[PDB]
Every structure is written in C-alpha cells, then in structure tokens.
Amino acid sequence: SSPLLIGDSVMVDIGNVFTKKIPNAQIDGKVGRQLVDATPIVKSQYKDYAAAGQKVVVELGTNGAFTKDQLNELLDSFGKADIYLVSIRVPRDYEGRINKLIYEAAEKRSNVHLVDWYKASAGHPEYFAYDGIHLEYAGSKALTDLIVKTMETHA
Template sequence: MKNKGTGMIWLLVIVIIALVYLGVHREVSSEPGEKVIANQPVVQSQQPVAQNQQQVSRNTPQPLKEEQPFTGNGVTAIGDSVMVGVEPYLKELLPDATVNGKESRQMVQAQKLITELETNGKLGDYIIIELGTNGPFNKKQLRNILTTLSGAKQVLLVTARVPKGWQDTVNTTIKDVAREFNNAKVVDWYAASEGKSDYFYKDGVHLKPEGSRYYASLLLEALEK
C-alpha cells in the first residue's frame, strides 16, 4: 500500500514536470511570431505618413516669383519745354528711362533726333513723343516718324494743350495718324488737363510741380496698360 502511494506521487510529479516543460517550450516558440505580428502595424502605419507628406507637398502652394518693378529701362521720351519740366518727376517713376526734352523743339526736328538716338543706342522699345507746343505739323511728317518707329513695341503720342491757333490741328493730326499704326497710342493730355488750370503757370502751357507730377503719372499709366 505504501509502495503504491509512493508510485502515485512520482507519477504526479512527472506529469507536472511534463506540463511545465510543454508550457515553457510553447511560450518560447510562439514569442518571435508574436513580435513579428506586433511589429507589422508599425511598418504599415509608416506608409500613410509618407503618402500624407507627399500629398501635403503637392497641395502646398509654391511661392510666386516677385514681379520686378518697371524702372523705365527701354523707355525713350522725346519732347519740348513741357517735357523738360516733367523730366524730374518722370525720372522719379522711371529712373532708367531716357528723357530728351528741349525748349522750342518742333515735330519737324524729331526725325533727325530719333536717328541720332538710335545710332547712339539710346532709342528704346517704348517711345513717348510730346511735340506740338511750338507749332503745327502735317500728317505726312508724323506718318514718316511712325514708319521709322514701326519696330518699336509702343509709341505714345501726347496731345497738346497750348492756347494757340494750331492746338486743335495738332491734336487732330495726332489722333488721325495714330489710328494707322498698330503700335501707336494716344495719351490725351488735352482732355486729361481739362478744368485743371491750377496745374499750369500763367502761360497755360508749362506746368507747376503738381501738374508735372500728374503728367508723369499719366505717361506711366499708359506704358503699363
């Protein structure tokens, strides 16, 4: 009876040892698999992050290149004493412009001046012509000048305000001939200065500083359009 009880005890011990051994072996063998499974979501979760970063990069607006200010490079202004008075104000707005004004200058002298400027490399692609204060000119004269300037990108023809008998003839000639050339545009100073007598000195032709500044702003506006 005693031997039988002892045998049962040993059998129980063997069973316990076997169960413990199987449990440990099972835990060890399954641990790497569990680690792999546990790590899988980490790898997968990294992909959406990268995709989101790419999406944000695509959707983020790229900075626009700043537009360079127009400094008047390539602009040539030709005129008479009115242009002489306007020059410092025009140069404030367009410091790189070439301004050539001269007292008593008339349209008949413009052709020779244009040739000289071109020869000296001072004739730009944007030309301003302010002439007519000192006398009239005919359509043929203006037409010849604009034909010479047919390669320019733009030619601005400024009407005159001068209390003389040729004022209306000058302005009509400018408007009529300008229609014949695609690159010619009229800046109607006569209309723009209507009712602004305080901009002029007593002669009704030459401009006070505020008038010259206004004149220069009209030229800039016409160039930018």
C-alpha cells in the first residue's frame, strides 16, 4: 500500500503508471543512477523502510554494472523488509552477469523475491524504446503489473 520503489531510468519511466495503480507508493528514480549510489541514499533517506513488514522494490543495473559486494551492501541496508528485486533487460555486455547476481541474491535471501522482468519481456520488443533502455507505455504497464502481482502473491 506504501512500498518504496528505488531505481534508475526504468523507475523514472514507470513511476507515473505505477502511482496510478498504487497511489501511496514512494518512488525514487533517477536516470543514470548506479547501484553503488543507492546504498548511501537508503541510509540518508529510507531507514524507516528497513523494517519487517515494509516492502521495497529495487530496480537497478539497467544504467550500469555492479559487483556482488555492492549488491549485498544494498540489500543488507534494507534489514528485514521484503525486497522485490527486478532483473534487467538491456543491450549491454554485462546484462547476463548482473542478472546472475540478482538471481543468486533471490536464491539466498528469504526476504528477497525475484521480479523476473528479463523473462517476462522476452519476445516483446514493443515494451522498449529503440535504445533498448527506456520503456514504452506498454512496457511500463507490463512491468508495473508484474511488480504488483509479485508483491500480491508475496512470491
């Protein structure tokens, strides 16, 4: 009902569509944001979300690669919150490596739930701008629906 959504350009793209579905969502998207820049923000802005019973959506990696250690530092900073971690689809050589880090984090952590946008958007070029980074409306609605459906299942 009041989840935190933190991400890069993709969060900017879906913010308005997502707010129509979940009006009390707290949305923090910034074009060009790197995952390593999110951890100080969570400590400066969002420690009230780092609690059992809170919900956080993390949408990072589309705008740049990150390391295992950086991902773990970010996930640890949310504490016992339920974390919905979105896989990425981007035309860059690091896409697979980052998606494997994301997959393994979800495998490990009982409070991390994978939102497999990579799999969901396979075969749907109409979801994406020609740059393969920004989303068309059809993509923003599909990703919004996937995030919300995952949170409603608790999966």
